[PDB]
Symmetry: C2
């Protein structure tokens, strides 16, 4: 039973956890309902953790950094979980848990958010959530974590190559990675350039202006200082009452997103609407039909076949 599973999860049973996550990842209407009851039971045991999101372009070094950070943390007495929303030395360790990405963005987002509750209830005190680069995936992850970390390249004038614009402003901390080999001095200059842009984007910020750090994830340099900064972010926000405020706001926002997706899905997933979408859009693109009149036809058609 749900009541049994909850007891085994919070008591720390290593076999219960993956079964609980499996229940949460299921989109069968029977499973969703018990999942919701299980999460209700475990919600009071959650929240005692720091949730950190980590993003950056393919090949910037996210997996290398996460592995090195995960070991740094395990050696300091933390229990560390890694999730991906789309590391062999780490996976070995009993105080780590690593899980691959679970359909749509809404769906992977929901499954990830619910899995966080389970991990925290199971005693994990650090949750690292990696993007797979792009969807609206960066925003989704930023909205479920306490501290969002952007990794960039350590090259003057080229740090943000390949990043979706607007992602810089999501970051609580920015890191220039691969500050090694022929790019030690270059990395400092590249960090100073990003710092200059961050001062322009946050010119009179008084609580937290995102720091720009350098790192060599492959040589294991800069991970400790990155975590020191993640802790300082939490301390600063907590002293201002904003750490809890951010979480409460994210939960209310997610509630309304669930309401939105439920009501919009009826229209979007409607086979007949899917059939006529192309032609209705073509008519709009060609100025043969107004957006308002095309919207009305979409709604009428959904309603006739719902």
């Amino acid at each position: 039973t749900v009541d049994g599973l909850a007891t085994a999860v919070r008591g720390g049973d290593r076999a219960a956890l993956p079964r609980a996550i499996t229940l949460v990842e299921s989109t069968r209407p029977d499973h969703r309902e018990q999942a919701q009851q299980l999460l209700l039971r475990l919600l009071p045991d959650s929240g005692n953790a720091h949730r950190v999101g980590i993003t950056g372009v393919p090949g910037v070094g996210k997996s290398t950094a996460i592995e090195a950070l995960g070991m740094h943390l395990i050696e300091r007495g933390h229990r560390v979980a890694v999730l991906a929303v789309d590391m062999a030395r780490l996976a070995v360790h009993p105080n780590a848990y690593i899980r691959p990405s679970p359909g749509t963005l809404g769906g992977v987002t929901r499954a990830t958010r619910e899995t966080v509750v389970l991990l925290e209830a199971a005693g994990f005190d650090v949750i690292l959530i990696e993007t797979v680069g792009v969807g609206q995936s960066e925003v989704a992850v930023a909205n479920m974590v306490d501290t969002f970390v952007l990794l960039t390249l350590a090259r003057t004038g080229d740090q943000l190559q390949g990043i979706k614009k607007g992602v810089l402003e999501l970051a609580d901390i920015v890191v220039v990675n691969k500050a090694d080999g022929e790019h030690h001095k270059e990395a400092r200059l590249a960090a100073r350039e990003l710092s200059a842009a961050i001062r322009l984007i946050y010119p009179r910020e008084a609580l937290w202006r995102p720091p720009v750090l350098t790192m060599s994830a492959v040589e294991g340099r800069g991970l400790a200082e990155l975590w020191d900064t993640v802790e300082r972010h939490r301390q600063v926000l907590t002293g201002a009452g904003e750490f809890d405020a951010r979480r409460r706001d994210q939960q209310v926002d997610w509630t309304w997103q669930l309401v939105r997706d439920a009501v919009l899905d009826r229209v979007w997933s409607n086979p007949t609407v899917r059939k006529v979408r192309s032609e209705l859009e073509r008519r709009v693109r060609a100025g043969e039909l107004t957006p308002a009149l095309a919207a009305q036809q979409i709604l009428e058609i959904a309603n006739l076949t719902d």
Copy 2:
């Protein structure tokens, strides 16, 4: 009749236009339906214009710049309309039309977008759309124009004071205003700093990297060069086939936004949902209820009272 009004608008009757806009601004269900028929008739006569959005903080100088730009353009044979989404020398002129902002953002957005169609049909070839600073108002205006212009302050390290973060990335052109009095050299340095950040945000952009210009709207300096740059934006995008692409994409996006707002409004505007919102949100904030379970209760309650 709608058929009569359309003939008078496209034939250039100055009395028909404000009546047509009045019909469009009405949210009475009878008016909305004729408005839609009128827009359908005039849609083929629209599109022959450059739509420019203009944003920046209160007091940066938007109204001063728009007045000076509007006169620059009128003197060059254009017919210029000014709309606001929330100038005495300009209002005097027969080849200008100025209209104050029309409920919600969705509502003002819809009325503004429809009014654009009417103005273009009436022979206006430049449409300037001013924000009133913030809502999600900047995004709304950027999504209905061809060229989005951000005005900022001409002070080194303080150009973006008061701007919602993420707004910089909406801009097709950035202008440092008030490059006058004691800030002539400072303005050049402030422009160079923004240019440096723009290079970092757009490091390998090949089609259009947003230029940063200086201006003194109050002394009438820099308006001509601002318009020269707006024309160059259109020429560059047109040569790449992106000018028409942007418009078609905005229209399809607006269509789906209308569908979204129709379906979400049923829930949001429901009196009973409004009544229980506070307590449901409090329960979510306190960890007494899951987002998914709160969403379900919101949907059930809407459905019971719909």
